[PDB]
Amino acid sequence: QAXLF
Amino acid sequence: QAXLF
Amino acid sequence: SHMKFTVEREHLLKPLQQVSGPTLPILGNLLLQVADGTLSLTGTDLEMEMVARVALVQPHEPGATTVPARKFFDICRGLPEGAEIAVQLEGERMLVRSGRSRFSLSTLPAADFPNLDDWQSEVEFTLPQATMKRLIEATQFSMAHQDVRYYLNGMLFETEGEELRTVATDGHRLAVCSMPIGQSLPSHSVIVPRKGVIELMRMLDGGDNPLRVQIGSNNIRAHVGDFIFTSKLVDGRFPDYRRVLPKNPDKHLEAGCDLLKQAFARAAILSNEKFRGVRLYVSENQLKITANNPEQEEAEEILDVTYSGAEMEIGFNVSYVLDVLNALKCENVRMMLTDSVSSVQIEDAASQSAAYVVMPMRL
Amino acid sequence: HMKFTVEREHLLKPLQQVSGPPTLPILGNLLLQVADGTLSLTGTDLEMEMVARVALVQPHEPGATTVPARKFFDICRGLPEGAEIAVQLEGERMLVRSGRSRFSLSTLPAADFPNLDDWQSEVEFTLPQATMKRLIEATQFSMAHQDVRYYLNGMLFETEGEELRTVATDGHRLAVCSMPIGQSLPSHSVIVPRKGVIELMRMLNPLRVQIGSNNIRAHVGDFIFTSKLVDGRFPDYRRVLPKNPDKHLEAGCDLLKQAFARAAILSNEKFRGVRLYVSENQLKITANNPEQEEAEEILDVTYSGAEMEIGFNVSYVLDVLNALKCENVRMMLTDSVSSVQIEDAASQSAAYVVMPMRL
């Protein structure tokens, strides 16, 4: 899972 | 609470 | 080994759901077997087993395997309404296909699946599913849960003359319900485990459809439609419920089931949260319910009842009284009292089929 | 001493809404106040407070006290339909009487009841309750829960021009919903805590909202809900929105939802990862788990972009498809390592941005 920022 | 037996 | 079957989604759902109803990995899987135009699904936890049979119209190949119960049911449930589910064993993987949806499931050998050891039936009879539902529903709530007296963690199923009876108790309250099934039965009494009572109860959604019950010395079986539920019986001695039934309850109270239930529910709010104690003061055509708690709060209810006996005071766990009033579901209720230290028999004023005995609390 | 007599039906919803939200004993009670033909009921947990006003037609005596919230509501709820509830303070116990039912409740002083400190409103407007319900419902699921970044454990409420906007995110997925309320508003942005969002949702006649620097208030009929705002800086959600999502997919909301729900069965139970392969008018969803089981779904979609592969947490995708509740959806992609903007194909009011998984 990649974070939005 | 009283037991039945 | 070369197991294959194609079947509708609707013909697989209830069979899968009932069977799927872990400690060892294989107990979390369902044993699937195809043989002579029949798909058999089997689930088990070693104490009880559910076998469901689904007839195969379309072409099939025989064989057997075990597959994850929850995932296979969720796959079939998730597919669209009216779906055609094509199943086939590919090596050590069970393939499920429907439309453009493909699922490869893991398997464990069918030889490793546990089976309940064979037994001989002693008692056997048939009755409507609604009669068995009524028998369980009327007494289920009085069964004990995790009691050290393991024999109370279940329901007594008893046959006598032409009646099937269910009895359930936890030492404080008792419930007994008898229903005539119109067949001459032998005198037999067995304890069905509370897990088995729940499973047996969860599969009776066919009302007047028949149910065949076969009882043995250590096992009980139930045939509902295409299902076969089997459970081990609790190996213990159930107490003599006839001994504890009130012998001479001279004092008879009669009141509205709902009005009495709403009064106990209101008084219960200010009763002790652990002991749930309420005090009943009965007098000429009147019932006064009182509840106290450690915060020095008090609830008091005065009702108009039909009572011509001597004035008396008696304590009770309000939850046990409410459970009986919720179970009766009638217009008027009858409480048959003796003294302040003896049990009360509570029944429907219009029916004797179900009776409830509650032991009081010392006030 | 306090005294009032009122119908059961005029007390139920006022008691139910006020009892909605025990650490310290007085927080489990409702402060009752009788004054000038009005009964005021007040519940609080120190962060938020709900005030309900019930008008008194029958004779009454002024005063105040606090009583157990749950027991007093259960007493009033348990009484028969059409009951007349006579209440009066007798020393240190409140007496509730109705017919032949009598209840003596314990009390704590009205002076000991906590009150939210006074504040001044900066922004103020009115809107229908359905518009506020839609705004919260559309973004509530994307709020974080017990996140170390405390400012994400809540919903951003933002006014700009003639629109009220709600924003909610947990760092992985984001939800925005904007609705026009037809009134010129100033540029203001505040974080309402997740507990306050739930209570504001629970009370939805017009709705009047008043917002300050550290507080927010909502007036619905005879109820007044107030909550403290989260004192933190919400991330600039505008910086996250996909800038140039060239690749556009269009499919049936339900068919896409049922395919992701089926594929999720054989996805990893911890990471919930699914792989999406988009090609000319086609979407293939694949799910794998450590038991070497695989689910695969091929759907007919509307897609004319370049062929690409992208990973996603299937729960975050299903949450967006469950929230949209529409006929068709629009998935707006960029590349395998950038976020996807998911919207209703017939409406731009609500947009959802999901960060993918490296799969």
**SS3 sequence of D232-264:** CCCCCHHHCCCCCCCEEEEEEHHHHHHHHHHHH
The β-bridge partners of D147 are none
Method: X-ray
For residues D176 and D238, give the distance between their C-alpha atoms in angstroms, rounded to a whole number. 10
CB contact under 8 A, B2 and C361: yes
Instruction: Give the structural domain span for C61.
Output: 4-112
| Contact assessment for residue D334 and residue D318, using Cβ atoms and an 8 Å cutoff | no
Angle at which helices D129-139 and D194-202 cross, to 10°: 140
What is the DSSP annotation of C229-298? EEEEPP-S----HHHHS-S---EEEEEEHHHHHHHHHHHHTTS-TTT-EEEEEEETTEEEEEEE-TT--E
Number of C-beta neighbours around residue D184 at 10 A: 9
The token duo for D257 is 């939802």
Distance, CA of D4 to CA of D53 (rounded, Å): 13
Gap from A5 CA to chain D (nearest CA, Å)? 7
At CB < 8 Å, which residues of chain B contact C? 1-5
Nearest to C122, CA basis, from C68, C206, C195, C188:
C188
Q: For residue C77, what is the enclosing H or E element?
A: helix C69-78
Q: Which of D224, D221, D196, D220 is nearest to D21 (CA)?
A: D196
d(CA C356, CA C359): 10
Instruction: Provide the angle, in degrees to the nearest 10, between the axes of the packed helices C257-268 and D69-78.
Output: 170
**Sign of the Cα pseudo-torsion (C54, C59, C64, C69, in order):** negative
Give the whole-angstrom CA distance, residue D79 versus residue D71: 12
* Contacts with C338 from chain B: Cβ below 8 Å: none
Q: Judging by beta carbons within 10 Å of its beta carbon (0-12, 13-18, 19+), is residue D16 exposed, middle or buried?
A: middle
Reported as type and span, the H/E element at residue D340 is: strand D340-344
Question: Nearest chain D Cα to C301, which residue?
Answer: D101
Q: What 8-state DSSP symbol labels residue D111?
A: G
Please report, as a single letter, which amino acid is at residue C39.
Answer: L
**Distance from C-alpha of D20 to C-alpha of D334, rounded to nearest angstrom:** 44
Question: Beta partners for D295?
Answer: C103, D287
Neighbours of C300 (CB within 10 A): 21
Least CB–CB distance from D169: residue in A1, A2, A4: A4
Does D171 contact A2 at a Cβ distance shorter than 8 Å? no
**String of DSSP letters for D7-41:** ESHHHHHHHHHHS----SGGGGEEEEEE-SSEEEE
Dihedral sign for Cα atoms in the order C299, C305, C311, C315:
negative
Minimum-distance CB partner of D297 among C100, C270, C303: C100
The residue among C151, C156, C172, C344 with the most chain B CBs within 10 A of its CB, best to mutate, is C172
**In this structure, which amino acid lies at residue C213?**
V
- Residue D181 distance to chain A (closest CA, Å): 30
> Nearest C-alpha of chain C: how many angstroms from B3?
5
Radius of gyration of chain B (CA): 5
What is the distance in angstroms between the Cα of C70 and the nearest Cα belonging to chain D? Answer: 9
What resolution in Å is listed for this PDB structure?
2.4
CB contact under 8 A, A2 and D355: yes
The answer to whether the beta carbons of residues D233 and D152 sit under 8 Å apart is: no
Q: What is the CB-side half-sphere exposure of residue D83 using CA atoms within 13 A?
A: 20
CA torsion angle for D279, D280, D283, D286 (degrees, to 10)? -30
Dist CA C345 CA C355 (whole Å): 7
Pair D312, D276: CB distance under 8 Å: yes
Q: D101-106 and C298-304: which strand pairing? A: antiparallel
Distance, in Å, from the CA atom of C52 to the CA atom of C46, rounded to the nearest integer, reads: 17
Sheet holding C344-348: strands in order across?
C154-169, C173-193, C351-358, C344-348, C332-337, C251-256, C306-307
- A-D Cβ pairs (cutoff 8 Å, strict): 28
* CA atoms within a 13 Å half-sphere pointing along the CA-CB vector of C345: 20
**CA of residue D60 relative to chain centroid, distance:** 37
Report the CATH number at residue D96: 3.10.150.10
Torsion-angle region of C44 (φ positive above 0: left; ψ -120 to 50: alpha; else: beta): beta
DSSP string, D270-333: TT-EEEEEEETTEEEEEEE-TT--EEEEEEE-EE-S--EEEEEEHHHHHHHHHHH-SSEEEEEE
Q: Write the single-letter amino acid at D252.
A: G
Q: By three-state DSSP, how is residue C139 classified? A: helix
- Would the CB atoms of B3 and C343 count as touching at under 8 Å? no
How many CB atoms lie under 10 A from the CB of residue C196? 23
Alpha-carbon gap, residue D94 to D77, rounded angstroms: 17
Q: Is the dihedral of CA C245, C250, C256, C262 positive or negative?
A: negative
Helix orientation angle between D253-263 and D314-324, rounded to the nearest 10 degrees: 150
Given a contact as 3+ CB pairs under 8 Å, which chains touch C? Answer: B, D
- Whole-angstrom Cα distance, residue D309 to residue D358? 10
Decide if D304 contacts D327 (C-beta within 8 A): no
CB distance C7 to C58 below 8 Å: yes
Q: How many residues does chain B have?
A: 5
Angstrom distances, CA of residue C361 to CA of B4, C173, D108: 11, 11, 32
* Eight-class DSSP state of D195: H
| Touching pair A, B by Cβ (3+ pairs < 8 Å) | no
- Is D101's CB within 8 Å of C301's CB? yes
Which residues in chain C are contacts of D79 at CB distance < 8 A? Answer: 266
| B5: nearest CA partner in chain C | C171
Report which of D121, D131, D120 is spatially closest to residue D200, judged by C-alpha positions.
Answer: D131
Which phi and psi angles does D167 have, rounded to 5°?
-135, 140
Give the DSSP letter of residue B3: -
Rounded to whole angstroms, how far apart are CA atoms C359 and D260? 55
Chains sharing 3 or more CB pairs under 8 A with chain D: A, C
Burial of D326 (0-12, 13-18, 19+ CB in 10 A): middle
User: Looking at the partner chain, which of C239, C317, C362 has a beta carbon nearest the beta carbon of B5?
Assistant: C239
